[PDB]
Amino acid sequence: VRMNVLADALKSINNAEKRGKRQVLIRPCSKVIVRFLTVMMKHGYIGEFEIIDDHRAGKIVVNLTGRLNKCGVISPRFDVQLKDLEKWQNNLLPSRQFGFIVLTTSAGIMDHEEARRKHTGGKILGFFF
Amino acid sequence: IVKPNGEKPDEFESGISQALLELEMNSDLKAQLRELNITAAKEIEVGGGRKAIIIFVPVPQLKSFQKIQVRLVRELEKKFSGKHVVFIAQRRILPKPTRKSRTKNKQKRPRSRTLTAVHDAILEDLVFPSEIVGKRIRVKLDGSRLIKVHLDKAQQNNVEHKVETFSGVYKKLTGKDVNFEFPEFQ
Amino acid sequence: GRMHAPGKGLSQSALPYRRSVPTWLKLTSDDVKEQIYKLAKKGLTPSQIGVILRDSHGVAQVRFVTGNKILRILKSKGLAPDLPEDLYHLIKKAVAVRKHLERNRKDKDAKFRLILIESRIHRLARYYKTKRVLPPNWKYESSTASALV
Amino acid sequence: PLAKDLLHPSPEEEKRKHKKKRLVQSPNSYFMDVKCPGCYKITTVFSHAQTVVLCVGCSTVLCQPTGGKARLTEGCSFRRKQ
Amino acid sequence: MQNDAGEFVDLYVPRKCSASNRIIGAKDHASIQMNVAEVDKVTGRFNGQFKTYAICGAIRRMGESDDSILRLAKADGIVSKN
Amino acid sequence: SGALDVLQMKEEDVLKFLAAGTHLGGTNLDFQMEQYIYKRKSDGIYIINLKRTWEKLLLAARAIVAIENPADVSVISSRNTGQRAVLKFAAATGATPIAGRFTPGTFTNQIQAAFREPRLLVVTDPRADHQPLTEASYVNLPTIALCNTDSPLRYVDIAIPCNNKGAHSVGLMWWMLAREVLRMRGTISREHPWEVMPDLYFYRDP
RNA sequence: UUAAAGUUGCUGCAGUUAAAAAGCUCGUAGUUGGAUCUCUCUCGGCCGAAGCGUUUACUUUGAAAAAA
Structure with missing residues (x-):
């Protein structure tokens, strides 16, 4: 189902x-x-x-x-602290220049570059590049 | 004729009450208008020069305003200049309960008093004699929205001219932008 | 895909978008409720009353006219059964499989077909005990079921 | 292929599809308005109706049910509601 | 493609397909660059200037190259509408 | 014909199309070619739309005109119903014909005797002469094909929906393509009709 | 003993023919589950108490976390 x-x-x-x-x-x-x-x-x-x-x-x-190129989902929605975001965006993204990880923080569904500014962790939803 | 919840009258709806008062002495709406009353009225601008006044009705009397709506629009737009009138029921919005709240909601809020379920029940009786038959929300490149409301083909020629004022009153009393279509078929 | 069958079949009803009672219907909600009380005093299920008003009396959805659906009308007037509609039709069906089975012992088709009707009963009795429509000690015993229906 | 228009299907393309596979679910049925010739009454009947619909006055049949569509009896004419 | 100094670090900038924005590779020999002339408006003779379309080889292998060149000509106003 | 009234279909050309029978397709339909169809009648024969056909000729004639060197178009037929129609198209236009048998490797094997390198290919029947089609996809060749309803659109680029089975309907389509290529070029223009009769392009059965 | 070992695999393997899908089905525990809802009262000098609200998981900050 x-x-x-x-x-x-x-x-x-x-x-x-x-x-x-x-x-x-x-x-x-x-x-x-x-x-x-x-x-x-x-x-x-x-x-x-x-x-x-x-x-x-x-x-x-x-x-x-x-x-x-690619649009993806992470299952389950693991919790991601901001000190552990670098490992996630090294396992999932093709380079340091493009591509985004979408995570659902309490400040809203955002990127990883937005979540770094507003200083927020969340749960990883997926990625796109 | 005007029942406000705080008993605060104003010179706008006084003329509306006096206009409704002749309907108990000139027309065939004698037995209807004795039980009915309005609760607010607001005259607003739409279209750059054109004026339109909205008239607020209590909720359990709204269904009794539908059977005499199309007559009262004629009898009310005839008596002064070109100003489109629409009847919107008075629905209370209860706020979305956060993790901190007062000791009032020991019974929970009904889902009829929610902002989504009121912001489209407004849309049903805004455009009254034609009915909504489809709906398509479009999200633009800048992230804004634009609702496209479809309507009935068979009730077109009496409400086809009002569809600029509908957009303006929906912009003012809801906040969202809307466009009205009359589709050719299903 | 259907529960205890390998068939992945697609056949249902398609409710329209326009939720309003149509123009021609000259029955008010009180008249529809008065129809429903008589059709329930005749001894019909809520699944049969909605058919008779659709075919003969021209009522598309009773939830669209009256504002309430069928079962919450009967359970508010009082003329409602204790065990629900679909649990009755499974218990009444598992009687007739079990009653026929003592005549023909060698029928290993309906011996397998009884367990599927059996295993659907406990899926519903669990749900009704959770939603507290059934008392929390109701159990399907295979011997008393001739006096439950 | 590869550039259709999914927002705006053609009206024959809408009517071909399944009633649940359309862009919005539209039912395939209707309410007719059957007139028995031997009487003078009007009885609103569902199209895909189940067990038989009797007139109240003449107490005769109107439509016996079938697989999909309830077939009217002979002489019973109908004019479709809206 | 650019550094901080703004200079361009590329061997070349490849052309993408006019239908699907896929990069036409270096050794993609099933690809097309097709020129379609523009006619004069009042006499219908060859103006000199033309429209250019590029089709990647995977689209063209799909067979979707006919209805891509056509609906790219309908957006440039070479094929009349409908 | 981008809403230009100079390029619109006249009353005589439709009489030619209906007298040859270009509007009558086969008894099957490819799923690529359903765009160009009008309807299926009784006795199965699909009726090819003719306002769609006239726009694909004038798209293809723009493609042929937009080549500078007139002998870079390579004009190909393998069935004999289009072998006279191709030598006469290439005579008046200037193209290079391969009528008959296309030996493979004409476009790939640079050592061969019959090696040539066209800039655009015009074939006649993509079911029949598929071997110039698949060999075009090694050397970057855009491709016109005079296509029937049941004829598959792989590697073709602007396929004219005609009836490429009857002998008159092939010669008339080559005649129309020659006429529009010459008219859209600098040669004798749209006032007086072309004095080259379309019966020159037909197939002569013994 | 660790890497090499994506030859123990959470990241991250395999299961037609190379090693391998239970004969079939029901089933309790486990695991996983479709749309949907935008802080106030009694006191002290407008600013602090006291209460919350249905309870949590999550996230961020703080203070506490032996030295080597």
């Missing part, structure tokens, strides 16, 4: 950047998907997306640029 809705909604948009498509449908949407998708959009990886409201649980249509 569907354990982890954010897992199936990222491998839906991973498998379509491979196949070269310009739009995905990702049903169902939670609001952790919309926060994660807005972080990818603000760093230019995705572009504009639309939340289709049926009364059940929304679907999202996401317009894709061709800029995303």
Whole structure:
């Protein structure tokens, strides 16, 4: 059964950047998907997306640029102290220059570069580059 | 005619109450308007020069305002200049309980008094004679949102001109930006 | 995918988006509740009352007209059964498998098919004991079940 | 392929799909309005209806149920609700 | 690609595909760079200037090169709308 | 034809299309080619849309015109229904024909006798002459193909939806491509019709 | 004895044919679980007490953590 809705909604948009498509449908949407998708959009990886409201649980249509190499989820959402963020962004990211780890801190779902400024730990949600 | 929760009248809704008062002596709404009363009224601007006044109704009387809505809009927009009127029920927003709170909520808040469930029940009776048939929220590049509300095709020609004032009153009393569509089909 | 079957089948109902009672329906909520009281005094389940109003009386969803659903109408008027609707139909089905089984001892099909009906009873009795719809000592015993239904 | 439009499917593309696989779930049924010829009444009947719908006045059949769609009897005409 | 001094540290800057933004590699010989002329507006003769499209080899091997060049010409206004 | 009324389809060209039967596709449809279809009638034959066909000729004629050297286009047919239509297209335009059998390695084996290096390939039937198609994908060749409904679009780049089975419908499509290449170039233009009859491009059965 | 050993594998292995998926199914414990909800009262000099709110996990700070 569907354990982890954010897992199936990222491998839906991973498998379509491979196949070269310009739009995905990702049903169902939670609001952790919309926060994660807005972080990818603000760093230019995705572009504009639309939340289709049926009364059940929304679907999202996401317009894709061709800029995303990989989009991933970490399961379980391990807890990440700020003194242990370097090991995580060395195991998961391709270089020191690009790519982001998304973690859910109490100040909001953010990057690892934002979470370093606001001095916050959290739980690792996933990564994109 | 005007029942405020704190008994604070104002010269805006006084004219609205006097306008409603002739409906118990000129029209066929004699038996309806004796039981009904409004609770607030607000005249606002939308569209750069155009004016529109919103009229607030208590909640358990709102369903009785629907059967006489389309007549009262005619009888009220006829009596003064072009000013669109819409009837929005008076729904209390209870705040989202944090980890620190007072000793009032020994019974919990109902989910009808939540900001999401009130910010779209406002939208249902804002646009009243046509009904919402779809909804699509779009998130733009800068992170802002833009709700696209679809409406009924069959009730188009009586509310097709109001759809700039709907956006303005939804911007003022909710904060969110909205656009209205009339789709061709399902 | 269905629980005790290998079939991954897709067949259900599709409720529409427009949640409002439509234009032509000339029944108020009090009239619908008055219909429901008579259809329950006739001895029908909540799953059968919603069918009769849909087919004949033109009511699409009783939750959309009355604001409340079927079972919370009957349990507030009082005309409601003690053990719930789906637990009854499993207990009544496990009687007829068990009753037929003493006639034909060699039937090793319905001996296997009894345990699936058995193992669905304890999945529901656990849920109803958790939500406190059943008392917390109710147990399905295979001998008393002819007087539970 | 590879550039469809998922926000705006065509109206024949919507009607081909499953009722749960559409962009928004739309039901495939309706409420008809059957008129028995031998009587003068109006009885609102679901399209995909189960066990039989009798008139209150003439007390005859209107539609016996089938697999999917309840078939009307002979002479029973209907005009679809909205 | 740049250091702090702003100078460009690259052998070359490769061209990406016009359909899918994939980098066309050095030894990707199934790739295309296609020129499509522009006509004069009033007489319909060859103006001199053209539009250029590049198609990566994986798209072209998929067979999606026909409907990519077409809908790239429809956005540049060479194919008439519908 | 980007909404230009000089390039729009005239009344005579549709009479030519319907008299040859270019609008009548096969009895199958590739999934790539469903964009160019109008509908399927009874007796199975798909009816090829003709406003779509005229826009793919004029896309392809822009592609041929945008090559400077007129003898860098290489014009290919292997079935004999397009072997007269190709020698006459290359005669009036200036291209280089390979009518008959395309021996493999024409574009790869630089030691060979028949080695040449085109800048654009025009083939006639991607089912039939697939061997110039797969060999183009080694040497970076864009590709026009006069495509039927059941003919697969791998390695083609702008495939004209015509009926490439009938002998008149192939010669007329080559005639239209020659006409539009010459008209969009500097030669004799759109006022008077082309005095080269389209029956020159047809296939002569003994 | 440690690395080499991604040949013990949490990171991070394998299981058609190389070693290997239980004959099949039910099932308690374990493990994992779909959408959804934007700080105030009695006192002291507006600023401190006292209470919280359903309880936690998480995260950040603090103080306490023998020397070598």
